[PDB]
């Protein structure tokens, strides 16, 4: 089976080569923030990030032919496949956190455009119920994420430092009247004190 | 202000392939073949032409419906 | 909640030489780019104009 | 070497069951802001690139044209047309 | 050049802040493809 | 806004989000998007090039990596000049052919 | 040619022909000015030098030729 | 650190920019229909 | 019950903008019962006043006529005289009185600076305008919200981190007088945020771009010889537009009342970041 | 009611802008285009701005 031989050789080469780099790629992703976790790969240097993203699906899906594999070779291929699956799960988690961060940043941008000096056409003195409820629900979800990340102190610290920055900016963007205490009840417990 | 203009290439796109330099000669050969084909067709169409104007060069006109085209003197 | 407000600094800051010096270069580059793009757009626009028609002509 | 110990630890150990529900309204708002800044800004450039060659080199988009010859039909007050297919080419440089 | 243009638009326009670096990169790729197509076609 | 319009807007945005998510995460569509993304990455970041960072010693750099620019320039120049000469030859051939055919 | 605007055709016997001639003469001056302008532009662009001119005169000034024909 | 054919890359980028601007703006290929009224005539 | 109000909001915004342009710099006299002959001997201070807590209050200048021969010649002294004698409801931050704490940073007659160590035009004809920092949210009168500035300062990890244990634990981290003069003229920042509030880039991107003061603190902690996270700090500050947004206006250095050079510090930071980016490729090979 | 505080004659955005922007935006445009535009226009007219009349302009119908 020449076609099978070529397929297995390609799969082995790509999977092992990218498994040897998954550690560095994940480290860079963790180092970068949640606004654009792939910012370093997009701007400075793509350290096999796109290659990992592409070949993770192939490792997960494409079949294997053990008769074309050795003993140590098969064990190494299995280890690389597990590493690629872990990379895929890590990327999914990072994408979810990044999208939540961008939700909060969308709320913050909506607030900012309201107070922008150039906003001579949509200047609103009083915050409206729709955005108030959005802020309340977003803060509730952020608190739930912080609680769920109790077993990973580094992840919790990064999530705070990154996401809660815009929550603190939203807190600062409005006066402390109206429904403000109820809206920021959960935030004021810990998060408000941190951003002071 | 900060000066930023420069003709130097960006290091993001200066990487080489594992086996050596980027695939330049192969793509140049492909482009040369494509240009040869395109220019050969263009030259063949362009140079071997003449305009013959005689009765046999004219055919009866017809509408989009297929009927002969005739316009009344209204 | 009454949204907070601020007074834009450039509306209440005395004119300074640093602002002028930096924004002069910025506006020079902006003018160059805008002039090039506007020339391109003008060439596109005028070339898109229709041909002159007869007097009191329909269609 | 950079001291990336904490980042390496984070990469090695991450949760595998944590997820956050996303506000559909806000996600749609951001996506349509991106769509707005795509169409209404980049479409100008894209359409310029696509069409300006078609405006400054129209003869290459219409290869074949038609020509007509007419003869009178007195007894019926009609006009007879003979068509001809020609290759669209420059004329009167 | 493209990077500078995107940076100016992002720093001056509040609404442009919505676009991600991924979206900026997609616009960059589309612009490069369109420029290459323009250069090739103009000589055809 | 009015609460009825709020209901309508929430339904519309939820429908848009569901449609986008379904189209992006559908099996065949997901595979297509994934392969197209990797292909676009390859095309954009690994296009043919003449200048690259040389991280190898002159003893460990191939002669192809040193003469690729010259080979490409020679190929392109030869193609252009040969096409020009072929155009001239075709012009002469057509002129002679039609002249000998008549007048 | 500066053709006169008064048609010399008999309207009583050739109405359509007279009307066509009258309209043609009426618009001839304007269309001749436009044609002269286009021809002048073409010839000056041809007189241009290198990339500013002769090197790419016939093939890139296609809209001008189309306008001239129209 | 060394970049192969860096001068060639610089010249290629400059040529690409020049060609793109040339075709986009048609700076060299101007229009003189506006100048026609302000020109003399022969013959 | 509520309904769509886009049209009403748009019309109100446009009308209010036009009316504000017509009636810009709205001024209210603190004591309208003043004769011009008396006003001849008193200088005019237009103090910005605004109380968002009160729903009925709006921003406005208040004109106070005071005798400059009753207090020392400083902006803070004049403000405190106005507060104590005329209207004790005025709000302003003040801790040191000698230009050390940096709490009194306000827009003193068109220039951001500390009010305690800034004199005012002695001429009685030209009025003196006192307003808070420009692009900082106004809480009350001359008090702004520096919480964002404090968080940005927190984000730089302003503490000495060392990867090498001290050899004996009974000594002090060695540092030569040259390595101390390296920090001289750079650690004197009092975090008054005037340079950041005057920086144009900080106006446009308060969050994504760190202030000149915070970047100067980062530069100080980087050039410090005792710390060993030099490359780590450089990489952290090289993210997105935390430093890249700076355009070298120099207004930070021009306005810095302490005489520091945050512009030069930012230029050095940019040079070091560029060198780091180049040598991340050059070295590892 | 939007109240705006703004020094029209002394703030950086105002009369200083009117004095600064027009002379800086047109720096490259003038100095570059005017010589370049003159060169492009004049290189065609080495001999003169003569319109070679391909049509009989001097001929008028009797
Ligand atoms: C020509 C006519 C026909 C064209 C058909 C095109 C078909 C495309 C369909 C795409 C389908 C999806 C692909 C998914 C990916 C699957 C493959 C894969 O993963 O890669 C494996 C293999 C290696 O990948 P890898 O292991 O991941 O390596 C990358 C890692 O970084 C690791 O890297 P490394 O450092 O270890 O080194 C590995 C090295 C390994 O590289 C190689 O081994 C490949 C080297 C090149 C080919 C060598 C063989 C040559 C001979 C082939 C003979 C084939 C005969 C076929 C017979 C058929 C008969 C029926 O990899 C590379 O360097 C990759 C090279 C990428 C080249 C990108 C080219 C972009 C420019 C194309 C346009 C040029 C126009 C110029 C015009 C200018 C005029 C002025 O990669 C490839 O196969 C490269 C494919 C790149 C081209 C795909 C895109 C083409 C699109 C063209 C434009 C069309 C636009 C039309 C309009 C749009 C609507 C239609
Ligand atoms: C606030 C309200 C203001 C209202 C403004 C209203 C303006 C209405 C204008 C109407 C249209 C005018 C068109 C003139 C075209 C000129 C060309 C020409 O005659 O060609 C014949 C034209 C065909 O042109 P073509 O030959 O195909 O090519 C033309 C291209 O321009 C190519 O020609 P070329 O290659 O020979 O070009 C010459 C070369 C020359 O370039 C150079 O070398 C540049 C030289 C510049 C020198 C400047 C010196 C100034 C000195 C400064 C001193 C400062 C010192 C300070 C001291 C401080 C103290 C120290 O290029 C240029 O001229 C550059 C043009 C590109 C412009 C770039 C900027 C565009 C964006 C910004 C626009 C302005 C915004 C202002 C905002 C104000 C806000 C407050 O055909 C005709 O016979 C048409 C005649 C024109 C009438 C067209 C009618 C169309 C009507 C359409 C319907 C809609 C109309 C609505 C009207 C609204 C009115 C309110
Ligand atoms: C003839 C050929 C055809 C021509 C038309 C071609 C059109 C192609 C499609 C255009 C699609 C554009 C929309 C998508 C882009 C992104 C927009 C976006 O972010 O959406 C949200 C953003 C709205 O955000 P927001 O939250 O509502 O606003 C508060 C945020 O703080 C706001 O934060 P921000 O910083 O993000 O917002 C800034 C926003 C700008 O929004 C604003 O904040 C205000 C906009 C209005 C400003 C009005 C002037 C105010 C006073 C200034 C001083 C003028 C003095 C004049 C008198 C001088 C006398 C000496 O900037 C933009 O819109 C960026 C793109 C602008 C350029 C593209 C659009 C050009 C349209 C030109 C035609 C306009 C209609 C005809 C008008 C003339 C009728 C006689 O934009 C919009 O939704 C509005 C879009 C713009 C509508 C038209 C307004 C007039 C603009 C005139 C520009 C003149 C330039 C000169 C060259 C013109 C040559 C034709
Ligand atoms: C109008 C112009 C159009 C053309 C120009 C286009 C330009 C623009 C770019 C277009 C980009 C977008 C393309 C559309 C997206 C395609 C998505 C897709 O394929 O969906 C499948 C994907 C399913 O696969 P999956 O879920 O990823 O995988 C698990 C499945 O269980 C499957 O499990 P399995 O293990 O049984 O099957 C795995 C594999 C079937 O496995 C096999 O039987 C073996 C396949 C070969 C493996 C690689 C061996 C390479 C050996 C070396 C070759 C060297 C050649 C000479 C050069 C040497 C020097 C370098 O089946 C696939 O999934 C095939 C995917 C496509 C080819 C992947 C291989 C790429 C590398 C080889 C080709 C390129 C040459 C590289 C040369 C350099 C290499 C270093 O999703 C779908 O089912 C969607 C279906 C509906 C969408 C449309 C389907 C179209 C199908 C096209 C098939 C084309 C086959 C190749 C033709 C080659 C002719 C020359
Ligand atoms: C579904 C998929 C996803 C879709 C997504 C949506 C978008 C579409 C994506 C599709 C993928 C393709 C996209 C195009 C590639 C984009 C590349 C890119 O953005 O790279 C940026 C990235 C920019 O990086 P950078 O840092 O700015 O560096 C750029 C500087 O320019 C640095 O540049 P450099 O220094 O490296 O220069 C480049 C190098 C590149 O050169 C090459 O190696 C290429 C050569 C051409 C080969 C062409 C091959 C074409 C093959 C076609 C085959 C048929 C295909 C049929 C398809 C059918 C469908 C199946 O050029 C040279 O070597 C210069 C040659 C100059 C020759 C000089 C001649 C002198 C003659 C005289 C001789 C001496 C005489 C002396 C006489 C003495 C008398 C006294 O570019 C690069 O680094 C690569 C170089 C640029 C390559 C451009 C390629 C464009 C290709 C366009 C193809 C369009 C086809 C459309 C088909 C439509 C059909 C319906
Ligand atoms: C075909 C249509 C043509 C229409 C032409 C319209 C021309 C419009 C020109 C606009 C110029 C730029 C200002 C508006 C856009 C600003 C966008 C931007 O990024 O700014 C955001 C910023 C404002 O936002 P910001 O300062 O809050 O910054 C954002 C900060 N965060 C993110 C925290 C919210 O800048 C401005 O908007 C500055 C506005 C200055 C306005 C100056 C007005 C001068 C008026 C002079 C009138 C002279 C009359 C003379 C009469 C003489 C009679 C004899
Ligand atoms: C700086 C940032 C912004 C930059 C923007 C850049 C934009 C780039 C755009 C690129 C594409 C260019 C396309 C150009 C199309 C021009 C069409 C046009 O108006 O042509 C003029 C035309 C008459 O021309 P023509 O028929 O040829 O006759 C003369 C022949 N010698 O005139 C007509 O036929 C008139 C009728 C058609 C035009 C109608 C216009 C309607 C406008 C409605 C505005 C609505 C909003 C109003 C807002 C204010 C309300 C108070
Ligand atoms: S650098 Fe100067 S102006 Fe800026 S915060 Fe420090 S002391 Fe204040
Ligand atoms: S004020 Fe602003 S942008 Fe640069 S040098 Fe000074 S910081
Ligand atoms: S009183 Fe302390 S800084 Fe002014
Ligand atoms: Ca150090």
mmCIF file with all atom_site columns, N, CA, C and O in Angstrom, chain F residues 26-54:
data_model
loop_
_atom_site.group_PDB
_atom_site.id
_atom_site.type_symbol
_atom_site.label_atom_id
_atom_site.label_alt_id
_atom_site.label_comp_id
_atom_site.label_asym_id
_atom_site.label_entity_id
_atom_site.label_seq_id
_atom_site.pdbx_PDB_ins_code
_atom_site.Cartn_x
_atom_site.Cartn_y
_atom_site.Cartn_z
_atom_site.occupancy
_atom_site.B_iso_or_equiv
_atom_site.pdbx_formal_charge
_atom_site.auth_seq_id
_atom_site.auth_comp_id
_atom_site.auth_asym_id
_atom_site.auth_atom_id
_atom_site.pdbx_PDB_model_num
ATOM 1   N N  . UNK F 1 26 ? -20.945 23.239 11.672 1.00 0.00 ? 26 UNK F N  1
ATOM 2   C CA . UNK F 1 26 ? -21.449 22.066 10.974 1.00 0.00 ? 26 UNK F CA 1
ATOM 3   C C  . UNK F 1 26 ? -20.283 21.251 10.426 1.00 0.00 ? 26 UNK F C  1
ATOM 4   O O  . UNK F 1 26 ? -19.264 21.805 10.005 1.00 0.00 ? 26 UNK F O  1
ATOM 5   N N  . UNK F 1 27 ? -20.433 19.928 10.443 1.00 0.00 ? 27 UNK F N  1
ATOM 6   C CA . UNK F 1 27 ? -19.347 19.031 10.127 1.00 0.00 ? 27 UNK F CA 1
ATOM 7   C C  . UNK F 1 27 ? -18.631 19.376 8.836  1.00 0.00 ? 27 UNK F C  1
ATOM 8   O O  . UNK F 1 27 ? -17.469 19.802 8.838  1.00 0.00 ? 27 UNK F O  1
ATOM 9   N N  . UNK F 1 28 ? -19.309 19.188 7.701  1.00 0.00 ? 28 UNK F N  1
ATOM 10  C CA . UNK F 1 28 ? -18.673 19.538 6.419  1.00 0.00 ? 28 UNK F CA 1
ATOM 11  C C  . UNK F 1 28 ? -18.235 20.990 6.342  1.00 0.00 ? 28 UNK F C  1
ATOM 12  O O  . UNK F 1 28 ? -17.130 21.277 5.862  1.00 0.00 ? 28 UNK F O  1
ATOM 13  N N  . UNK F 1 29 ? -19.065 21.916 6.826  1.00 0.00 ? 29 UNK F N  1
ATOM 14  C CA . UNK F 1 29 ? -18.692 23.327 6.795  1.00 0.00 ? 29 UNK F CA 1
ATOM 15  C C  . UNK F 1 29 ? -17.484 23.593 7.684  1.00 0.00 ? 29 UNK F C  1
ATOM 16  O O  . UNK F 1 29 ? -16.588 24.359 7.314  1.00 0.00 ? 29 UNK F O  1
ATOM 17  N N  . UNK F 1 30 ? -17.447 22.972 8.867  1.00 0.00 ? 30 UNK F N  1
ATOM 18  C CA . UNK F 1 30 ? -16.307 23.150 9.759  1.00 0.00 ? 30 UNK F CA 1
ATOM 19  C C  . UNK F 1 30 ? -15.024 22.647 9.114  1.00 0.00 ? 30 UNK F C  1
ATOM 20  O O  . UNK F 1 30 ? -13.988 23.322 9.164  1.00 0.00 ? 30 UNK F O  1
ATOM 21  N N  . UNK F 1 31 ? -15.075 21.463 8.499  1.00 0.00 ? 31 UNK F N  1
ATOM 22  C CA . UNK F 1 31 ? -13.892 20.927 7.832  1.00 0.00 ? 31 UNK F CA 1
ATOM 23  C C  . UNK F 1 31 ? -13.447 21.837 6.696  1.00 0.00 ? 31 UNK F C  1
ATOM 24  O O  . UNK F 1 31 ? -12.248 22.094 6.526  1.00 0.00 ? 31 UNK F O  1
ATOM 25  N N  . UNK F 1 32 ? -14.399 22.330 5.904  1.00 0.00 ? 32 UNK F N  1
ATOM 26  C CA . UNK F 1 32 ? -14.056 23.235 4.814  1.00 0.00 ? 32 UNK F CA 1
ATOM 27  C C  . UNK F 1 32 ? -13.372 24.486 5.344  1.00 0.00 ? 32 UNK F C  1
ATOM 28  O O  . UNK F 1 32 ? -12.349 24.923 4.807  1.00 0.00 ? 32 UNK F O  1
ATOM 29  N N  . UNK F 1 33 ? -13.923 25.074 6.408  1.00 0.00 ? 33 UNK F N  1
ATOM 30  C CA . UNK F 1 33 ? -13.355 26.303 6.954  1.00 0.00 ? 33 UNK F CA 1
ATOM 31  C C  . UNK F 1 33 ? -11.957 26.040 7.494  1.00 0.00 ? 33 UNK F C  1
ATOM 32  O O  . UNK F 1 33 ? -11.037 26.841 7.302  1.00 0.00 ? 33 UNK F O  1
ATOM 33  N N  . UNK F 1 34 ? -11.776 24.906 8.165  1.00 0.00 ? 34 UNK F N  1
ATOM 34  C CA . UNK F 1 34 ? -10.476 24.558 8.719  1.00 0.00 ? 34 UNK F CA 1
ATOM 35  C C  . UNK F 1 34 ? -9.424  24.393 7.622  1.00 0.00 ? 34 UNK F C  1
ATOM 36  O O  . UNK F 1 34 ? -8.336  24.990 7.688  1.00 0.00 ? 34 UNK F O  1
ATOM 37  N N  . UNK F 1 35 ? -9.744  23.614 6.584  1.00 0.00 ? 35 UNK F N  1
ATOM 38  C CA . UNK F 1 35 ? -8.778  23.388 5.513  1.00 0.00 ? 35 UNK F CA 1
ATOM 39  C C  . UNK F 1 35 ? -8.506  24.677 4.753  1.00 0.00 ? 35 UNK F C  1
ATOM 40  O O  . UNK F 1 35 ? -7.358  24.961 4.390  1.00 0.00 ? 35 UNK F O  1
ATOM 41  N N  . UNK F 1 36 ? -9.544  25.488 4.531  1.00 0.00 ? 36 UNK F N  1
ATOM 42  C CA . UNK F 1 36 ? -9.364  26.755 3.835  1.00 0.00 ? 36 UNK F CA 1
ATOM 43  C C  . UNK F 1 36 ? -8.508  27.713 4.653  1.00 0.00 ? 36 UNK F C  1
ATOM 44  O O  . UNK F 1 36 ? -7.701  28.462 4.095  1.00 0.00 ? 36 UNK F O  1
ATOM 45  N N  . UNK F 1 37 ? -8.667  27.703 5.979  1.00 0.00 ? 37 UNK F N  1
ATOM 46  C CA . UNK F 1 37 ? -7.841  28.544 6.839  1.00 0.00 ? 37 UNK F CA 1
ATOM 47  C C  . UNK F 1 37 ? -6.381  28.133 6.759  1.00 0.00 ? 37 UNK F C  1
ATOM 48  O O  . UNK F 1 37 ? -5.489  28.982 6.625  1.00 0.00 ? 37 UNK F O  1
ATOM 49  N N  . UNK F 1 38 ? -6.109  26.830 6.837  1.00 0.00 ? 38 UNK F N  1
ATOM 50  C CA . UNK F 1 38 ? -4.712  26.417 6.746  1.00 0.00 ? 38 UNK F CA 1
ATOM 51  C C  . UNK F 1 38 ? -4.137  26.730 5.371  1.00 0.00 ? 38 UNK F C  1
ATOM 52  O O  . UNK F 1 38 ? -2.973  27.131 5.253  1.00 0.00 ? 38 UNK F O  1
ATOM 53  N N  . UNK F 1 39 ? -4.936  26.542 4.320  1.00 0.00 ? 39 UNK F N  1
ATOM 54  C CA . UNK F 1 39 ? -4.478  26.854 2.972  1.00 0.00 ? 39 UNK F CA 1
ATOM 55  C C  . UNK F 1 39 ? -4.172  28.339 2.824  1.00 0.00 ? 39 UNK F C  1
ATOM 56  O O  . UNK F 1 39 ? -3.167  28.713 2.210  1.00 0.00 ? 39 UNK F O  1
ATOM 57  N N  . UNK F 1 40 ? -5.036  29.200 3.365  1.00 0.00 ? 40 UNK F N  1
ATOM 58  C CA . UNK F 1 40 ? -4.780  30.633 3.293  1.00 0.00 ? 40 UNK F CA 1
ATOM 59  C C  . UNK F 1 40 ? -3.519  30.995 4.060  1.00 0.00 ? 40 UNK F C  1
ATOM 60  O O  . UNK F 1 40 ? -2.728  31.836 3.613  1.00 0.00 ? 40 UNK F O  1
ATOM 61  N N  . UNK F 1 41 ? -3.315  30.378 5.226  1.00 0.00 ? 41 UNK F N  1
ATOM 62  C CA . UNK F 1 41 ? -2.081  30.618 5.964  1.00 0.00 ? 41 UNK F CA 1
ATOM 63  C C  . UNK F 1 41 ? -0.868  30.230 5.130  1.00 0.00 ? 41 UNK F C  1
ATOM 64  O O  . UNK F 1 41 ? 0.108   30.985 5.044  1.00 0.00 ? 41 UNK F O  1
ATOM 65  N N  . UNK F 1 42 ? -0.913  29.055 4.496  1.00 0.00 ? 42 UNK F N  1
ATOM 66  C CA . UNK F 1 42 ? 0.213   28.636 3.667  1.00 0.00 ? 42 UNK F CA 1
ATOM 67  C C  . UNK F 1 42 ? 0.446   29.614 2.524  1.00 0.00 ? 42 UNK F C  1
ATOM 68  O O  . UNK F 1 42 ? 1.589   29.995 2.246  1.00 0.00 ? 42 UNK F O  1
ATOM 69  N N  . UNK F 1 43 ? -0.624  30.034 1.849  1.00 0.00 ? 43 UNK F N  1
ATOM 70  C CA . UNK F 1 43 ? -0.466  30.924 0.705  1.00 0.00 ? 43 UNK F CA 1
ATOM 71  C C  . UNK F 1 43 ? 0.127   32.262 1.121  1.00 0.00 ? 43 UNK F C  1
ATOM 72  O O  . UNK F 1 43 ? 1.014   32.794 0.444  1.00 0.00 ? 43 UNK F O  1
ATOM 73  N N  . UNK F 1 44 ? -0.344  32.824 2.237  1.00 0.00 ? 44 UNK F N  1
ATOM 74  C CA . UNK F 1 44 ? 0.075   34.171 2.609  1.00 0.00 ? 44 UNK F CA 1
ATOM 75  C C  . UNK F 1 44 ? 1.457   34.178 3.253  1.00 0.00 ? 44 UNK F C  1
ATOM 76  O O  . UNK F 1 44 ? 2.306   35.005 2.899  1.00 0.00 ? 44 UNK F O  1
ATOM 77  N N  . UNK F 1 45 ? 1.710   33.270 4.196  1.00 0.00 ? 45 UNK F N  1
ATOM 78  C CA . UNK F 1 45 ? 2.954   33.300 4.953  1.00 0.00 ? 45 UNK F CA 1
ATOM 79  C C  . UNK F 1 45 ? 4.057   32.439 4.352  1.00 0.00 ? 45 UNK F C  1
ATOM 80  O O  . UNK F 1 45 ? 5.181   32.460 4.867  1.00 0.00 ? 45 UNK F O  1
ATOM 81  N N  . UNK F 1 46 ? 3.778   31.688 3.288  1.00 0.00 ? 46 UNK F N  1
ATOM 82  C CA . UNK F 1 46 ? 4.783   30.833 2.663  1.00 0.00 ? 46 UNK F CA 1
ATOM 83  C C  . UNK F 1 46 ? 4.726   30.964 1.148  1.00 0.00 ? 46 UNK F C  1
ATOM 84  O O  . UNK F 1 46 ? 4.847   29.978 0.415  1.00 0.00 ? 46 UNK F O  1
ATOM 85  N N  . UNK F 1 47 ? 4.540   32.186 0.660  1.00 0.00 ? 47 UNK F N  1
ATOM 86  C CA . UNK F 1 47 ? 4.591   32.440 -0.767 1.00 0.00 ? 47 UNK F CA 1
ATOM 87  C C  . UNK F 1 47 ? 6.036   32.378 -1.258 1.00 0.00 ? 47 UNK F C  1
ATOM 88  O O  . UNK F 1 47 ? 6.975   32.526 -0.472 1.00 0.00 ? 47 UNK F O  1
ATOM 89  N N  . UNK F 1 48 ? 6.243   32.155 -2.556 1.00 0.00 ? 48 UNK F N  1
ATOM 90  C CA . UNK F 1 48 ? 7.613   32.163 -3.083 1.00 0.00 ? 48 UNK F CA 1
ATOM 91  C C  . UNK F 1 48 ? 8.288   33.499 -2.818 1.00 0.00 ? 48 UNK F C  1
ATOM 92  O O  . UNK F 1 48 ? 7.666   34.559 -2.906 1.00 0.00 ? 48 UNK F O  1
ATOM 93  N N  . UNK F 1 49 ? 9.576   33.440 -2.489 1.00 0.00 ? 49 UNK F N  1
ATOM 94  C CA . UNK F 1 49 ? 10.308  34.627 -2.075 1.00 0.00 ? 49 UNK F CA 1
ATOM 95  C C  . UNK F 1 49 ? 11.754  34.511 -2.532 1.00 0.00 ? 49 UNK F C  1
ATOM 96  O O  . UNK F 1 49 ? 12.261  33.415 -2.789 1.00 0.00 ? 49 UNK F O  1
ATOM 97  N N  . UNK F 1 50 ? 12.415  35.663 -2.624 1.00 0.00 ? 50 UNK F N  1
ATOM 98  C CA . UNK F 1 50 ? 13.810  35.722 -3.036 1.00 0.00 ? 50 UNK F CA 1
ATOM 99  C C  . UNK F 1 50 ? 14.742  36.111 -1.896 1.00 0.00 ? 50 UNK F C  1
ATOM 100 O O  . UNK F 1 50 ? 15.936  35.779 -1.956 1.00 0.00 ? 50 UNK F O  1
ATOM 101 N N  . UNK F 1 51 ? 14.247  36.796 -0.869 1.00 0.00 ? 51 UNK F N  1
ATOM 102 C CA . UNK F 1 51 ? 15.055  37.227 0.263  1.00 0.00 ? 51 UNK F CA 1
ATOM 103 C C  . UNK F 1 51 ? 14.575  36.525 1.524  1.00 0.00 ? 51 UNK F C  1
ATOM 104 O O  . UNK F 1 51 ? 13.369  36.472 1.789  1.00 0.00 ? 51 UNK F O  1
ATOM 105 N N  . UNK F 1 52 ? 15.517  35.987 2.294  1.00 0.00 ? 52 UNK F N  1
ATOM 106 C CA . UNK F 1 52 ? 15.195  35.280 3.523  1.00 0.00 ? 52 UNK F CA 1
ATOM 107 C C  . UNK F 1 52 ? 16.372  35.390 4.481  1.00 0.00 ? 52 UNK F C  1
ATOM 108 O O  . UNK F 1 52 ? 17.508  35.650 4.075  1.00 0.00 ? 52 UNK F O  1
ATOM 109 N N  . UNK F 1 53 ? 16.084  35.187 5.767  1.00 0.00 ? 53 UNK F N  1
ATOM 110 C CA . UNK F 1 53 ? 17.125  35.238 6.785  1.00 0.00 ? 53 UNK F CA 1
ATOM 111 C C  . UNK F 1 53 ? 18.018  34.013 6.652  1.00 0.00 ? 53 UNK F C  1
ATOM 112 O O  . UNK F 1 53 ? 17.535  32.874 6.598  1.00 0.00 ? 53 UNK F O  1
ATOM 113 N N  . UNK F 1 54 ? 19.329  34.241 6.598  1.00 0.00 ? 54 UNK F N  1
ATOM 114 C CA . UNK F 1 54 ? 20.311  33.172 6.457  1.00 0.00 ? 54 UNK F CA 1
ATOM 115 C C  . UNK F 1 54 ? 20.911  32.887 7.830  1.00 0.00 ? 54 UNK F C  1
ATOM 116 O O  . UNK F 1 54 ? 21.734  33.661 8.329  1.00 0.00 ? 54 UNK F O  1
#
